[PDB]
Amino acid sequence: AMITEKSAALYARAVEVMPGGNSRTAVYSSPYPVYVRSGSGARVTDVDGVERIDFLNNSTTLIHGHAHPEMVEAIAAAVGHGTSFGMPTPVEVEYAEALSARNETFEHVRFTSSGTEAVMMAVQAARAYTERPKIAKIAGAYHGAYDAVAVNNDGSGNLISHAVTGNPEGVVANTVVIPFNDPEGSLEVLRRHADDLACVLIDPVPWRIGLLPASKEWLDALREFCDASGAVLISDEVGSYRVGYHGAMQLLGAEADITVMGKVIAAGMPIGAVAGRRRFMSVFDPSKGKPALPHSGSYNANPVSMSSGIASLRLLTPQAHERIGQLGEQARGSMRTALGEAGLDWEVNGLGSLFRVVANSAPAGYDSAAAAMKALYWKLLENGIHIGDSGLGCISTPMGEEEIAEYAVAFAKSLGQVLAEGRA
């Protein structure tokens, strides 16, 4: 049924000028991904002219969906005045005020062009502040390509060092790994390295290890350990921020020293932010002589990304937050019902507007749970829906009851087709 000839033709061009026709590993699919030309509200139109409802929204970036009229106005108007400057602008101050207001701990903020840069600068800030070499991170949690955090970032629960080919021992030996939601197991590792730990880097709701939230007991253990050891508690909320109106740590009853943010804080334009207590952020302060930590970047605080940010936070009202949370609860409930009726032991995790289908037992005709989930991703595409190829999805503010109802129909139909093709 599904026609992808224009996607195939774009891929045939792409392989001549990009490695395997790819510029972003996460969006690749074999033998080629679906190419898209436009988005409007909750819907994306592919290069073959097929409109689908987007339930992943650029990996949870597009909290306001595609080309939101108020976002388009703010961004296009900013572009008309100048895309970037070698001088600060009013909108960087306005946006820093808007973001600082979202959480007590966001006292001082700095902007980057990506969550990847923001995580790197948060780690560098903790190292500059403490003058200690080691960082602790969660086993399996992903924090972007920065080499110190590109360690055990593949969804594995194992604590054994596993890094990208070529990442030197000099980097890998200074990143230690803790088990998510295991207070005793985490404190064993942290206490071993306490004298040398610059920071404990967590994601309070890491999707790669199942999109389960950090427990109160685990967050309390890490908070107490950081207070006692002087290690900086860094909450990487580039993905998980959106679960709470004041971010993920606040929802789960905890306080970070530094929070890393991105994605929804500008809802489509390149952004990252490091937001923390004044004392941790003081390493960046250049106003009292040379800063401990120089931090530049050609697009830092560029007025287009700042204008995108102001519009995104303005549209992200308590009412909008509550409504996408309701739709997320409805979507997760409907998926659990459909999986149960299909006779699968698969789970659905998530908070607020985030969800993940977690494939457990491989059904007949699939070599793995992951292969069955990829098949479900492709069947959902055929049935007019975009989700993640490992089960990640999210609600956007343009969605209503009708989009979630259509999703429920497509999900049940797609499960049926996946299972039937496995038994064929």
Added chain:
Amino acid sequence: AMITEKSAALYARAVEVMPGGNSRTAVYSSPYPVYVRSGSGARVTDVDGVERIDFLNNSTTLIHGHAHPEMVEAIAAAVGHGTSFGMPTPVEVEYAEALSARNETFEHVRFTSSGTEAVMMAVQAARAYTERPKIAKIAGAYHGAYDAVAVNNDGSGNLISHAVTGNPEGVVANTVVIPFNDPEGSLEVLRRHADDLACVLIDPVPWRIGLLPASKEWLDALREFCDASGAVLISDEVGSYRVGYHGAMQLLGAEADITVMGKVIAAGMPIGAVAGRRRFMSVFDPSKGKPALPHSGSYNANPVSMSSGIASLRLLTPQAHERIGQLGEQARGSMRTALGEAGLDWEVNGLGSLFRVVANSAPAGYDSAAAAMKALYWKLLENGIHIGDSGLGCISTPMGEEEIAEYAVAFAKSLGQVLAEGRA
């Protein structure tokens, strides 16, 4: 004469929500920088309503100046179709084709959201390709905040390891430094580390050590060493690309294995690129199983940055390149004349549309050459001109001979005022 009350008021707000009221170290000035609201062509209007000619252009990013109508049209149209997607787009393929066409060596390209990310991924690519730990870089050359390259990046010619506070020995010990344009001195260091060298990372025209080009003999020595040792030759042209129509290495008669690009390739929107021979870029290829080097990023190849790129390269014609080169030659000549007539021993370096005033002897009343150059930066601001506070500047395509003549008048006047205030 100069009124900055609205800049002072923005700074008073900024210090409450940013460390020292700063989000980008390079744009800070004491006691506060001038804040700007808009740019049009070659001119920038500050928050106090003062229009000045911009001779630095967001640190040499804005080759087409501010809000170029053809750039604004292309970017606004892309924004209207969707700012970013979890799927590739036609414009990423079109832009990869356009950028690949600029140089024989740009066989495969990958896009990032910054030059900082692009340098990091080029280093990671060389480490993945060679499975060797060490990188060599130029003593004093700047390549962004990535910790492996944030070593000896401060304009010093000394080879002694000097890193940011907190950068661990594990990182710093794997970055070795070579003396710019010293073939024998460079080969001594490179031969010592040959078995363990993943890459030699150069900038062919590094501005921080004076904006002098790499010599044929030095480039030949490095090229021969990389061929013999298997180390990857990486040319970081994020700043220096614009000196040549095919980039900096090609202008100077040399070939890189991998080239890092940014700034002018999109001329205002967040971008970086890694471009190189297929074999070096193959570490990123995800089409024949798991890639050696995963490389994602929420804004990689986003259609707004791709559309900015297509428009920038379309406007960057051989004719535009030639004319801004003429204006650069005129500007450098006029500054040398003015410095000579003022009785200063200061030099003016640069190729094509780039220049740098290199302050040598401190005149009466200044503690350093750098302090005298900062005073000249402030006097030029008073006299209607933006340059860099350490002498960097560049031509934009909206400039004509009249803007360079106005600059020459302001430059001579500013030198006079700097010298008079020193003797006061």
